[PDB]
Amino acid sequence: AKHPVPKKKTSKARRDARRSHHALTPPTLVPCPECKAMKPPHTVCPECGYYAGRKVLEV
Amino acid sequence: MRHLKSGRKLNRHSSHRLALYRNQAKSLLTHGRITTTVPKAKELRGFVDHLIHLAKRGDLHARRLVLRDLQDVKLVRKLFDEIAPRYRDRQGGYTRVLKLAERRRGDGAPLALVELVE
Amino acid sequence: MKGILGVKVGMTRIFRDDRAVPVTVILAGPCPVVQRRTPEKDGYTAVQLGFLPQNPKRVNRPLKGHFAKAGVEPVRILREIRDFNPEGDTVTVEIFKPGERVDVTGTSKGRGFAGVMKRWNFAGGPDSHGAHKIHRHPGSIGNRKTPGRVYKGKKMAGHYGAERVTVMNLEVVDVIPEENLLLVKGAVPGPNGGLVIVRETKKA
Amino acid sequence: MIQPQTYLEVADNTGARKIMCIRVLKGSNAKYATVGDVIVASVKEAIPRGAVKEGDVVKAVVVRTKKEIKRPDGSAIRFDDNAAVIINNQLEPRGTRVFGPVARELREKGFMKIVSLAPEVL
Amino acid sequence: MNRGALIKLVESRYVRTDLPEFRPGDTVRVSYKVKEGNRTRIQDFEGIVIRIRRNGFNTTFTVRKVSYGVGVERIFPLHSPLIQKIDIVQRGRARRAKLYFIRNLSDREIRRKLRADRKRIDQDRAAERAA
RNA sequence: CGAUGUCGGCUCGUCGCAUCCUGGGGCUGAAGAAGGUCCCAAGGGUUGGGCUGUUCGCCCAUUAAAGCGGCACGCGAGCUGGGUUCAGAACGUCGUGAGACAGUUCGGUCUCUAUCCGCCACGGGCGCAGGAGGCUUGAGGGGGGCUCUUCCUAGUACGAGAGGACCGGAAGGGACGCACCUCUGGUUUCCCAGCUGUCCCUCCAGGGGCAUAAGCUGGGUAGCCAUGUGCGGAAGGGAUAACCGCUGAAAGCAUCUAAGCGGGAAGCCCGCCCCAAGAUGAGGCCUCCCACGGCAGCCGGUAAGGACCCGGGAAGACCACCCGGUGGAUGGGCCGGGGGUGUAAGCGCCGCGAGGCGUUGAGCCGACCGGUCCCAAUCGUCCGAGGUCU
RNA sequence: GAAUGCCGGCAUGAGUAACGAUAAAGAGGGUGAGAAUCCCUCUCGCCGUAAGCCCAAGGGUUCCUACGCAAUGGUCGUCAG
RNA sequence: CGUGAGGGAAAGGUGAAAAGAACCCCGGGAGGGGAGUGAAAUAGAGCCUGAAACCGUGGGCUUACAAGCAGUCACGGCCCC
Ligand SMILES: [Mg+2]
Ligand SMILES: [Mg+2]
Ligand SMILES: [Mg+2]
Ligand SMILES: [Mg+2]
Ligand SMILES: [Mg+2]
Ligand SMILES: [Mg+2]
Ligand SMILES: [Mg+2]
Ligand SMILES: [Mg+2]
Ligand SMILES: [Mg+2]
Ligand SMILES: [Mg+2]
Ligand SMILES: [Mg+2]
Ligand SMILES: [Mg+2]
Ligand SMILES: [Mg+2]
Ligand SMILES: [Mg+2]
Ligand SMILES: [Mg+2]
Ligand SMILES: [Mg+2]
Ligand SMILES: [Mg+2]
Ligand SMILES: [Mg+2]
Ligand SMILES: [Mg+2]
Ligand SMILES: [Mg+2]
Ligand SMILES: [Mg+2]
Ligand SMILES: [Mg+2]
Ligand SMILES: [Mg+2]
Ligand SMILES: [Mg+2]
Ligand SMILES: [Mg+2]
Ligand SMILES: [Mg+2]
Ligand SMILES: [Mg+2]
Ligand SMILES: [Mg+2]
Ligand SMILES: [Mg+2]
Ligand SMILES: [Mg+2]
Ligand SMILES: [Mg+2]
Ligand SMILES: [Mg+2]
Ligand SMILES: [Mg+2]
Ligand SMILES: [Mg+2]
Ligand SMILES: [Mg+2]
Ligand SMILES: [Mg+2]
Ligand SMILES: [Mg+2]
Ligand SMILES: [Mg+2]
Ligand SMILES: [Mg+2]
Ligand SMILES: [Mg+2]
Ligand SMILES: [Mg+2]
Ligand SMILES: [Mg+2]
Ligand SMILES: [Mg+2]
Ligand SMILES: [Mg+2]
Ligand SMILES: [Mg+2]
Ligand SMILES: [Mg+2]
Ligand SMILES: [Mg+2]
Ligand SMILES: [Mg+2]
Ligand SMILES: [Mg+2]
Ligand SMILES: [Mg+2]
Ligand SMILES: [Mg+2]
Ligand SMILES: [Mg+2]
Ligand SMILES: [Mg+2]
Ligand SMILES: [Mg+2]
Ligand SMILES: [Mg+2]
Ligand SMILES: [Mg+2]
Ligand SMILES: [Mg+2]
Ligand SMILES: [Mg+2]
Ligand SMILES: [Mg+2]
Ligand SMILES: [Mg+2]
Ligand SMILES: [Mg+2]
Ligand SMILES: [Mg+2]
Ligand SMILES: [Mg+2]
Ligand SMILES: [Mg+2]
Ligand SMILES: [Mg+2]
Ligand SMILES: [Mg+2]
Ligand SMILES: [Mg+2]
Ligand SMILES: [Mg+2]
Ligand SMILES: [Mg+2]
Ligand SMILES: [Mg+2]
Ligand SMILES: [Mg+2]
Ligand SMILES: [Mg+2]
Ligand SMILES: [Mg+2]
Ligand SMILES: [Mg+2]
Ligand SMILES: [Mg+2]
Ligand SMILES: [Mg+2]
Ligand SMILES: [Mg+2]
Ligand SMILES: [Mg+2]
Ligand SMILES: [Mg+2]
Ligand SMILES: [Mg+2]
Ligand SMILES: [Mg+2]
Ligand SMILES: [Mg+2]
Ligand SMILES: [Mg+2]
Ligand SMILES: [Mg+2]
Ligand SMILES: [Mg+2]
Ligand SMILES: [Mg+2]
Ligand SMILES: [Mg+2]
Ligand SMILES: [Mg+2]
Ligand SMILES: [Mg+2]
Ligand SMILES: [Mg+2]
Ligand SMILES: [Mg+2]
Ligand SMILES: [Mg+2]
Ligand SMILES: [Mg+2]
Ligand SMILES: [Mg+2]
Ligand SMILES: [Mg+2]
Ligand SMILES: [Mg+2]
Ligand SMILES: [Mg+2]
Ligand SMILES: [Mg+2]
Ligand SMILES: [Mg+2]
Ligand SMILES: [Mg+2]
Ligand SMILES: [Mg+2]
Ligand SMILES: [Mg+2]
Ligand SMILES: [Mg+2]
Ligand SMILES: [Mg+2]
Ligand SMILES: [Mg+2]
Ligand SMILES: [Mg+2]
Ligand SMILES: [Mg+2]
Ligand SMILES: [Mg+2]
Ligand SMILES: [Mg+2]
Ligand SMILES: [Mg+2]
Ligand SMILES: [Mg+2]
Ligand SMILES: [Mg+2]
Ligand SMILES: [Mg+2]
Ligand SMILES: [Mg+2]
Ligand SMILES: [Mg+2]
Ligand SMILES: [Mg+2]
Ligand SMILES: [Mg+2]
Ligand SMILES: [Mg+2]
Ligand SMILES: [Mg+2]
Ligand SMILES: [Mg+2]
Ligand SMILES: [Mg+2]
Ligand SMILES: [Mg+2]
Ligand SMILES: [Mg+2]
Ligand SMILES: [Mg+2]
Ligand SMILES: [Mg+2]
Ligand SMILES: [Mg+2]
Ligand SMILES: [Mg+2]
Ligand SMILES: [Mg+2]
Ligand SMILES: [Mg+2]
Ligand SMILES: [Mg+2]
Ligand SMILES: [Mg+2]
Ligand SMILES: [Mg+2]
Ligand SMILES: [Mg+2]
Ligand SMILES: [Mg+2]
Ligand SMILES: [Mg+2]
Ligand SMILES: [Mg+2]
Ligand SMILES: [Mg+2]
Ligand SMILES: [Mg+2]
Ligand SMILES: [Mg+2]
Ligand SMILES: [Mg+2]
Ligand SMILES: [Mg+2]
Ligand SMILES: [Mg+2]
Ligand SMILES: [Mg+2]
Ligand SMILES: [Mg+2]
Ligand SMILES: [Mg+2]
Ligand SMILES: [Mg+2]
Ligand SMILES: [Mg+2]
Ligand SMILES: [Mg+2]
Ligand SMILES: [Mg+2]
Ligand SMILES: [Mg+2]
Ligand SMILES: [Mg+2]
Ligand SMILES: [Mg+2]
Ligand SMILES: [Mg+2]
Ligand SMILES: [Mg+2]
Ligand SMILES: [Mg+2]
Ligand SMILES: [Mg+2]
Ligand SMILES: [Mg+2]
Ligand SMILES: [Mg+2]
Ligand SMILES: [Mg+2]
Ligand SMILES: [Mg+2]
Ligand SMILES: [Mg+2]
Ligand SMILES: [Mg+2]
Ligand SMILES: [Mg+2]
Ligand SMILES: [Mg+2]
Ligand SMILES: [Mg+2]
Ligand SMILES: [Mg+2]
Ligand SMILES: [Mg+2]
Ligand SMILES: [Mg+2]
Ligand SMILES: [Mg+2]
Ligand SMILES: [Mg+2]
Ligand SMILES: [Mg+2]
Ligand SMILES: [Mg+2]
Ligand SMILES: [Mg+2]
Ligand SMILES: [Mg+2]
Ligand SMILES: [Mg+2]
Ligand SMILES: [Mg+2]
Ligand SMILES: [Mg+2]
Ligand SMILES: [Mg+2]
Ligand SMILES: [Mg+2]
Ligand SMILES: [Mg+2]
Ligand SMILES: [Mg+2]
Ligand SMILES: [Mg+2]
Ligand SMILES: [Mg+2]
Ligand SMILES: [Mg+2]
Ligand SMILES: [Mg+2]
Ligand SMILES: [Mg+2]
Ligand SMILES: [Mg+2]
Ligand SMILES: [Mg+2]
Ligand SMILES: [Mg+2]
Ligand SMILES: [Mg+2]
Ligand SMILES: [Mg+2]
Ligand SMILES: [Mg+2]
Ligand SMILES: [Mg+2]
Ligand SMILES: [Mg+2]
Ligand SMILES: [Mg+2]
Ligand SMILES: [Mg+2]
Ligand SMILES: [Mg+2]
Ligand SMILES: [Mg+2]
Ligand SMILES: [Mg+2]
Ligand SMILES: [Mg+2]
Ligand SMILES: [Mg+2]
Ligand SMILES: [Mg+2]
Ligand SMILES: [Mg+2]
Ligand SMILES: [Mg+2]
Ligand SMILES: [Mg+2]
Ligand SMILES: [Mg+2]
Ligand SMILES: [Mg+2]
Ligand SMILES: [Mg+2]
Ligand SMILES: [Mg+2]
Ligand SMILES: [Mg+2]
Ligand SMILES: [Mg+2]
Ligand SMILES: [Mg+2]
Ligand SMILES: [Mg+2]
Ligand SMILES: [Mg+2]
Ligand SMILES: [Mg+2]
Ligand SMILES: [Mg+2]
Ligand SMILES: [Mg+2]
Ligand SMILES: [Mg+2]
Ligand SMILES: [Mg+2]
Ligand SMILES: [Mg+2]
Ligand SMILES: [Mg+2]
Ligand SMILES: [Mg+2]
Ligand SMILES: [Mg+2]
Ligand SMILES: [Mg+2]
Ligand SMILES: [Mg+2]
Ligand SMILES: [Mg+2]
Ligand SMILES: [Mg+2]
Ligand SMILES: [Mg+2]
Ligand SMILES: [Mg+2]
Ligand SMILES: [Mg+2]
Ligand SMILES: [Mg+2]
Ligand SMILES: [Mg+2]
Ligand SMILES: [Zn+2]
């Protein structure tokens, strides 16, 4: 190879346009049916340790 | 292509991956429940379930087969005397994986519990 | 034209006049007529076939109304056969008889991101004599200042397969109506389990 | 499955012992010769005082191959060597006897005399 | 649906059951139907079976023999209609499924390596004492 | 000249036509067969070797043919580095010498990261006046386009003979292309077995690690594959080229042409296969939802639907696509079958012993074809029409 | 306003290459505001003419213990030259 | 920095006065919010003034059929005085 290099500085517009797909998407959260805490679905609740309606975990 | 290929690789060569499964089995069979990454948890099910099933058969041959992976005679003895008889009527499904809510801080890894079923 | 929708089940071979005959087995019918395309209504002629029954608890409301207007139970797949107006309300393997030739359309197996050697049978590069990290590379992709660009349609690495492919003029070796089974001599695109379309051949 | 550079045993009594295919006589650019195909070959080894000698450029028909031959009945046949019989421009054998078995494909390709001269046809 | 059962169903018209069970290392005589012009005859191929390649109806087996100084191998579909009959000429006992290694052995070394399978030879004698 | 890397090769093509072959023709000092010469024709095709850095060329063996040129003597941010083209060394030769030679000879550092255009693939956004779930039309693109032999007609027409057709018909090939894995043949990183050395468990027996990122060796399912299997080039229609005509004046004859009509190419248009409505010219059909509250606008709750999350997938870099989510067989286990390996351990018996025989096609056993709710897809959340105007 | 000018500041490339031998990890327990990364136990792997031990150069407090984590450590850090 | 001869930097400013922010609140701390001091605290010690490049939050106009040395001339739409 022969060391490719940028030909022109990237403009503010083109830099920020490239970044138009970078925004985070918020985390998916459901209420825990036992303690009403907001938590990812399909995880053992980190606030009360219940899952599938029963205590799985000391928290 | 990976078409219809079975079994994770876990970025380990042959002997390391086999030693990973053996070591996790000893740990799970010892404590009843462990925490790993979700991918490791899922692959550990089939490995342990097979050892538990051979324990249920109970013969000398089964014990010698199990010993190839577990090596600890006192632990195989625990597997045959205590662990296996509480699964006499259970046909498969001797382990369960439940995903944990919080990721590991240093690398974001999703975690899961693996345990023996009641 | 005449056609039917099907599932590719697998390959084997039968013996016919002391010859081994490679066959692909297709589970073709039966296919209810769910809609007819007419020149007055739709501007052309074809029959929308249905295939494989579905759990209604999975069929949403606009689809349910479409089946109900046809008086047909909920089906997994709708596909049209162009220029085909079957007389009955159901197309089965019996539209084909042994000795006929058919065109079979499937979705080919997917190579994913394929190199230029798998996709286009490029020769690649030498594996010794100083060859330097270009063993599977395409080589040159053009000229110089004229034209100073790369042609459209240049053959390059990229996704390969999982596309519609039609193999033409296949011999129907047997029909087993009791099991809605079609035996076609030769190879048919896609995996076992894949949806295929079997049409009367366009080759004379 | 024979191509230029391939060595073949000589299944006849022409005097030649080893020939080296230099051409597959099967069109513009055939890649391989099988049983029943004709090759041009150089004679690389011959016994003293035979009809053919070393350095002769001869034609021969491939009579058996190490690459197994497929048949429409679903079966196949495979020999331990790559063997040829040296022929003239009329496809006739130049020797008077052929050694070892020969493929039955030869018969269908018009080498009747070689088929009969053989001890076994498989 | 059961795609495997459907395939087995298509093959069912062609499966045969008249042929005798054999193992790699056995010596076998295959009576095989052959065309030649302007007739069709039965040619016997007799040799050691060095491979049984199993796939249900698509099982095939390979028989090796030396003919007139040259080794020959034939692959036969185990359910070919062109097989008239198979005769067990000798039971050999091997220690492995594939006997490719005998392609490199002298005939003496083969006789040493594939000795007669007494257990199965007696089994063939006991049977065939039919009523 | 604050650098436009320079021969040849390899790879990858694409174009011109002054055409090497294949298709169509006129003339022939064209009997036939085979040639010669010119015209039309660029759709496809145009082999493998020996020599030399070679381009070129010669030679060998074939071929329908082994075409000639352009693209920075196409292509070194694609590779090579034989040549050429620094520093070393030598020969011939020139020069008193230092040194010199498109003369020769041996050797001699070819730079991981692509910003923009371009190209190959894949998404996200918004649009397509109501919002949705399907199924589609095909404007316009692309892909493909090759050819040989044998046989019949017929040893006929033609020819003294040798030789040997048109037209029409049949079979078999080569290379190339697409797909596939039943068969043939590969691989198959742990599916099975055998083996050595060493260390260990537990002394025997039985096993485990390591000897590679499989210690070695003999095998090997699914998958992915070619060497294996199927299928393709068309047919057919339309308009033409060169060329050949019909009728026919100007020009009482003649003339394919000035009016008019016909025949006629592997080439052109269509036909086949694939993409395709961002075709903003945003298409069509079937079906579903509805005119909801508060102030071509806004605010919130809903509708048909959809997304999230999860189990996964011959789908896949992410994404996307597809299937499933307890009203469930989606993965995992377990069971049966297939498949591989090829007779486990233990015990009995024979041998002083290494071992052997029996139990036993046993034991082990990935992916393949299925079964089974044992394990896990719990529980849920958030979006989403109220239909501008003539 | 330019001198491939000088000094300084701050951009672009870009959330990109990389994070320095492919000897390799797993779990449980503890500490802590915080743990893949610190301590402890068990399992696994690697070196063993060394990747173990002693000495001479050179280096110059890096040694031991307590307390601590802003910076240094290619991540993290409760640990540490 | 260099074995050495030798080379050789950068770096000034709270306020009149430390009156240098007790005490409370979130935080492990860092940092901040109140309180308080001061004529002044975007004079709070990373301190006079505090330009420019460069980065960000809010608002007005505008932009997803479009060909561009990016301006200029014209007209029209919207927003503001
Ligand atoms: Mg390079
Ligand atoms: Mg380069
Ligand atoms: Mg580069
Ligand atoms: Mg390089
Ligand atoms: Mg670079
Ligand atoms: Mg540049
Ligand atoms: Mg901006
Ligand atoms: Mg950009
Ligand atoms: Mg708490
Ligand atoms: Mg794929
Ligand atoms: Mg791979
Ligand atoms: Mg799976
Ligand atoms: Mg996998
Ligand atoms: Mg594995
Ligand atoms: Mg791996
Ligand atoms: Mg990794
Ligand atoms: Mg690792
Ligand atoms: Mg290892
Ligand atoms: Mg190893
Ligand atoms: Mg996954
Ligand atoms: Mg879970
Ligand atoms: Mg999570
Ligand atoms: Mg951490
Ligand atoms: Mg399809
Ligand atoms: Mg490639
Ligand atoms: Mg390839
Ligand atoms: Mg391809
Ligand atoms: Mg190549
Ligand atoms: Mg290659
Ligand atoms: Mg090479
Ligand atoms: Mg190199
Ligand atoms: Mg290099
Ligand atoms: Mg290399
Ligand atoms: Mg390249
Ligand atoms: Mg240009
Ligand atoms: Mg795709
Ligand atoms: Mg039949
Ligand atoms: Mg398949
Ligand atoms: Mg000589
Ligand atoms: Mg011989
Ligand atoms: Mg099958
Ligand atoms: Mg069935
Ligand atoms: Mg015979
Ligand atoms: Mg024999
Ligand atoms: Mg018969
Ligand atoms: Mg210059
Ligand atoms: Mg410059
Ligand atoms: Mg310049
Ligand atoms: Mg330069
Ligand atoms: Mg060219
Ligand atoms: Mg011309
Ligand atoms: Mg020509
Ligand atoms: Mg011609
Ligand atoms: Mg003539
Ligand atoms: Mg003549
Ligand atoms: Mg002519
Ligand atoms: Mg002419
Ligand atoms: Mg002319
Ligand atoms: Mg052409
Ligand atoms: Mg062209
Ligand atoms: Mg050309
Ligand atoms: Mg050549
Ligand atoms: Mg050479
Ligand atoms: Mg040579
Ligand atoms: Mg050469
Ligand atoms: Mg040359
Ligand atoms: Mg020359
Ligand atoms: Mg010459
Ligand atoms: Mg010729
Ligand atoms: Mg010719
Ligand atoms: Mg040129
Ligand atoms: Mg140039
Ligand atoms: Mg020139
Ligand atoms: Mg020149
Ligand atoms: Mg050039
Ligand atoms: Mg050239
Ligand atoms: Mg070049
Ligand atoms: Mg280069
Ligand atoms: Mg070059
Ligand atoms: Mg270049
Ligand atoms: Mg360059
Ligand atoms: Mg380049
Ligand atoms: Mg360049
Ligand atoms: Mg050189
Ligand atoms: Mg040289
Ligand atoms: Mg030279
Ligand atoms: Mg020189
Ligand atoms: Mg120099
Ligand atoms: Mg030099
Ligand atoms: Mg010299
Ligand atoms: Mg001299
Ligand atoms: Mg001179
Ligand atoms: Mg001179
Ligand atoms: Mg002189
Ligand atoms: Mg002199
Ligand atoms: Mg000079
Ligand atoms: Mg010189
Ligand atoms: Mg020169
Ligand atoms: Mg010179
Ligand atoms: Mg010289
Ligand atoms: Mg050298
Ligand atoms: Mg040189
Ligand atoms: Mg560089
Ligand atoms: Mg980079
Ligand atoms: Mg780029
Ligand atoms: Mg540009
Ligand atoms: Mg889109
Ligand atoms: Mg989108
Ligand atoms: Mg329409
Ligand atoms: Mg079109
Ligand atoms: Mg367009
Ligand atoms: Mg076209
Ligand atoms: Mg005749
Ligand atoms: Mg005559
Ligand atoms: Mg003809
Ligand atoms: Mg053909
Ligand atoms: Mg298979
Ligand atoms: Mg295979
Ligand atoms: Mg097979
Ligand atoms: Mg095989
Ligand atoms: Mg194993
Ligand atoms: Mg050992
Ligand atoms: Mg010991
Ligand atoms: Mg011990
Ligand atoms: Mg022992
Ligand atoms: Mg060890
Ligand atoms: Mg190792
Ligand atoms: Mg091993
Ligand atoms: Mg060995
Ligand atoms: Mg093998
Ligand atoms: Mg192996
Ligand atoms: Mg396989
Ligand atoms: Mg092939
Ligand atoms: Mg016409
Ligand atoms: Mg006149
Ligand atoms: Mg006239
Ligand atoms: Mg006219
Ligand atoms: Mg006409
Ligand atoms: Mg005409
Ligand atoms: Mg005419
Ligand atoms: Mg035509
Ligand atoms: Mg053609
Ligand atoms: Mg389409
Ligand atoms: Mg549309
Ligand atoms: Mg469409
Ligand atoms: Mg347009
Ligand atoms: Mg539409
Ligand atoms: Mg809903
Ligand atoms: Mg996935
Ligand atoms: Mg992602
Ligand atoms: Mg869908
Ligand atoms: Mg769904
Ligand atoms: Mg649900
Ligand atoms: Mg439910
Ligand atoms: Mg399931
Ligand atoms: Mg299952
Ligand atoms: Mg199973
Ligand atoms: Mg079985
Ligand atoms: Mg079996
Ligand atoms: Mg035994
Ligand atoms: Mg035993
Ligand atoms: Mg004894
Ligand atoms: Mg005994
Ligand atoms: Mg089984
Ligand atoms: Mg299993
Ligand atoms: Mg359940
Ligand atoms: Mg059920
Ligand atoms: Mg919930
Ligand atoms: Mg100036
Ligand atoms: Mg500069
Ligand atoms: Mg500069
Ligand atoms: Mg400067
Ligand atoms: Mg300046
Ligand atoms: Mg400066
Ligand atoms: Mg600067
Ligand atoms: Mg920057
Ligand atoms: Mg910078
Ligand atoms: Mg990224
Ligand atoms: Mg980049
Ligand atoms: Mg990257
Ligand atoms: Mg670095
Ligand atoms: Mg990286
Ligand atoms: Mg590195
Ligand atoms: Mg590293
Ligand atoms: Mg811990
Ligand atoms: Mg802990
Ligand atoms: Mg830590
Ligand atoms: Mg921490
Ligand atoms: Mg520790
Ligand atoms: Mg070691
Ligand atoms: Mg030692
Ligand atoms: Mg000292
Ligand atoms: Mg120091
Ligand atoms: Mg000390
Ligand atoms: Mg200290
Ligand atoms: Mg210390
Ligand atoms: Mg401490
Ligand atoms: Mg620190
Ligand atoms: Mg820190
Ligand atoms: Mg910190
Ligand atoms: Mg401090
Ligand atoms: Mg640091
Ligand atoms: Mg740090
Ligand atoms: Mg570092
Ligand atoms: Mg602390
Ligand atoms: Mg430290
Ligand atoms: Mg110095
Ligand atoms: Mg110093
Ligand atoms: Mg100095
Ligand atoms: Mg200063
Ligand atoms: Mg002061
Ligand atoms: Mg002051
Ligand atoms: Mg405080
Ligand atoms: Mg605090
Ligand atoms: Mg606090
Ligand atoms: Mg403070
Ligand atoms: Mg605060
Ligand atoms: Mg404060
Ligand atoms: Mg105050
Ligand atoms: Mg004042
Ligand atoms: Mg101020
Ligand atoms: Mg101030
Ligand atoms: Mg002042
Ligand atoms: Mg200030
Ligand atoms: Mg400031
Ligand atoms: Mg500023
Ligand atoms: Mg800015
Ligand atoms: Mg803004
Ligand atoms: Mg437009
Ligand atoms: Mg617009
Ligand atoms: Mg303007
Ligand atoms: Mg105006
Ligand atoms: Zn909870």
Side-chain angles (χ1 to χ4, degrees), chain B residues 14 17:
Chain B
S14 326
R17 198 169 48 252

PDB file of all heavy atoms in Angstrom, chain B residues 14 17, chain F residues 190 214:
ATOM      1  N   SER B  14      -9.605 -25.841  21.019  1.00  0.00           N
ATOM      2  CA  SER B  14     -10.243 -27.098  21.423  1.00  0.00           C
ATOM      3  C   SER B  14     -10.114 -27.363  22.916  1.00  0.00           C
ATOM      4  O   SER B  14     -11.116 -27.504  23.628  1.00  0.00           O
ATOM      5  CB  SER B  14      -9.630 -28.279  20.675  1.00  0.00           C
ATOM      6  OG  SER B  14      -9.255 -27.943  19.369  1.00  0.00           O
ATOM      7  N   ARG B  17     -11.624 -24.760  25.422  1.00  0.00           N
ATOM      8  CA  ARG B  17     -13.076 -24.758  25.509  1.00  0.00           C
ATOM      9  C   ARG B  17     -13.571 -25.969  26.279  1.00  0.00           C
ATOM     10  O   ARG B  17     -14.478 -25.853  27.113  1.00  0.00           O
ATOM     11  CB  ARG B  17     -13.697 -24.704  24.110  1.00  0.00           C
ATOM     12  CG  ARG B  17     -15.160 -24.267  24.120  1.00  0.00           C
ATOM     13  CD  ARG B  17     -15.687 -23.969  22.744  1.00  0.00           C
ATOM     14  NE  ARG B  17     -15.343 -25.027  21.811  1.00  0.00           N
ATOM     15  CZ  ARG B  17     -14.435 -24.916  20.851  1.00  0.00           C
ATOM     16  NH1 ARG B  17     -13.767 -23.791  20.671  1.00  0.00           N
ATOM     17  NH2 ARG B  17     -14.188 -25.941  20.080  1.00  0.00           N
TER      18      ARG B  17
ATOM     19  P     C F 190     -13.328 -29.023  18.319  1.00  0.00           P
ATOM     20  OP1   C F 190     -13.846 -27.881  19.065  1.00  0.00           O
ATOM     21  OP2   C F 190     -11.929 -29.409  18.586  1.00  0.00           O
ATOM     22  O5'   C F 190     -14.331 -30.214  18.663  1.00  0.00           O
ATOM     23  C5'   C F 190     -14.678 -31.212  17.717  1.00  0.00           C
ATOM     24  C4'   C F 190     -14.521 -32.607  18.274  1.00  0.00           C
ATOM     25  O4'   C F 190     -13.146 -33.049  18.092  1.00  0.00           O
ATOM     26  C3'   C F 190     -14.844 -32.794  19.763  1.00  0.00           C
ATOM     27  O3'   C F 190     -15.486 -34.049  19.963  1.00  0.00           O
ATOM     28  C2'   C F 190     -13.460 -32.875  20.397  1.00  0.00           C
ATOM     29  O2'   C F 190     -13.405 -33.601  21.605  1.00  0.00           O
ATOM     30  C1'   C F 190     -12.661 -33.573  19.305  1.00  0.00           C
ATOM     31  N1    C F 190     -11.219 -33.333  19.412  1.00  0.00           N
ATOM     32  C2    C F 190     -10.374 -34.425  19.609  1.00  0.00           C
ATOM     33  O2    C F 190     -10.866 -35.558  19.628  1.00  0.00           O
ATOM     34  N3    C F 190      -9.043 -34.217  19.752  1.00  0.00           N
ATOM     35  C4    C F 190      -8.552 -32.972  19.729  1.00  0.00           C
ATOM     36  N4    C F 190      -7.231 -32.813  19.876  1.00  0.00           N
ATOM     37  C5    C F 190      -9.400 -31.841  19.543  1.00  0.00           C
ATOM     38  C6    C F 190     -10.711 -32.065  19.400  1.00  0.00           C
ATOM     39  P     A F 214      -5.974 -26.713  18.666  1.00  0.00           P
ATOM     40  OP1   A F 214      -7.456 -26.741  18.735  1.00  0.00           O
ATOM     41  OP2   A F 214      -5.102 -27.155  19.789  1.00  0.00           O
ATOM     42  O5'   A F 214      -5.497 -27.531  17.387  1.00  0.00           O
ATOM     43  C5'   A F 214      -4.529 -28.565  17.487  1.00  0.00           C
ATOM     44  C4'   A F 214      -5.082 -29.794  18.165  1.00  0.00           C
ATOM     45  O4'   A F 214      -6.249 -30.281  17.444  1.00  0.00           O
ATOM     46  C3'   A F 214      -4.123 -30.981  18.252  1.00  0.00           C
ATOM     47  O3'   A F 214      -4.432 -31.715  19.433  1.00  0.00           O
ATOM     48  C2'   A F 214      -4.523 -31.806  17.037  1.00  0.00           C
ATOM     49  O2'   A F 214      -4.132 -33.158  17.083  1.00  0.00           O
ATOM     50  C1'   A F 214      -6.036 -31.634  17.067  1.00  0.00           C
ATOM     51  N9    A F 214      -6.722 -31.859  15.796  1.00  0.00           N
ATOM     52  C8    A F 214      -7.928 -32.487  15.649  1.00  0.00           C
ATOM     53  N7    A F 214      -8.345 -32.517  14.409  1.00  0.00           N
ATOM     54  C5    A F 214      -7.351 -31.855  13.698  1.00  0.00           C
ATOM     55  C6    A F 214      -7.201 -31.559  12.327  1.00  0.00           C
ATOM     56  N6    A F 214      -8.097 -31.908  11.389  1.00  0.00           N
ATOM     57  N1    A F 214      -6.090 -30.882  11.944  1.00  0.00           N
ATOM     58  C2    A F 214      -5.200 -30.532  12.873  1.00  0.00           C
ATOM     59  N3    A F 214      -5.244 -30.752  14.186  1.00  0.00           N
ATOM     60  C4    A F 214      -6.351 -31.427  14.542  1.00  0.00           C
TER      61        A F 214
END
